[PDB]
Amino acid sequence: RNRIPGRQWIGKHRRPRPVSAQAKQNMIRRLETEAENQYWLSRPFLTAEQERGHAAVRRAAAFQALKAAQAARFPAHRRLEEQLGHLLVTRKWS
C-alpha cells in the first residue's frame, strides 16, 4: 500500500529511516576516542627547531641499502651441477 517512489535511498523522496540510540552511543564513543587522540596530539616532546635533522643518517643509510638491493638485481650463476644432474634421469640398475 505504502510505496517508496523511485529507488529506496536515491530519489528526492527517500526512506525516512531514523537514527537509533545505538548509533548515537556509537558516535559519542567515537567522538570521545577522537577527543582523547587530539588531546594526546597537543604537547610534543621535541620542538620543530629541536627536531631539525635529528634522524638523517638513518634515513640516508636506509636509502643506500634500498639502492644497493635494487642494483644487486642480476641473473644467478649457472653451475655444472644443474646441467649434469639431468643425466641422472636414466640411472638404472646393472
Partner: protein
C-alpha cells in the same frame, strides 16, 4: 542530483543525521524542582 537549496527539505545523509542527533541541545536540569522548593 538536487541543488544546494531546495523546497523539499533536502532529506539528509545518514551520517549528518546522526551528527545532528548527537549535537541536539540538552537543557540543564536541576536536581530539585524550584517551583515548590522553599
Amino acid at each position: 542530483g538536487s541543488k544546494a537549496v531546495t523546497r523539499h527539505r533536502r532529506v539528509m545523509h545518514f551520517e549528518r543525521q546522526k551528527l545532528m542527533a548527537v549535537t541536539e541541545y540538552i537543557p540543564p536540569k536541576p536536581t530539585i524542582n524550584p517551583r515548590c522548593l522553599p
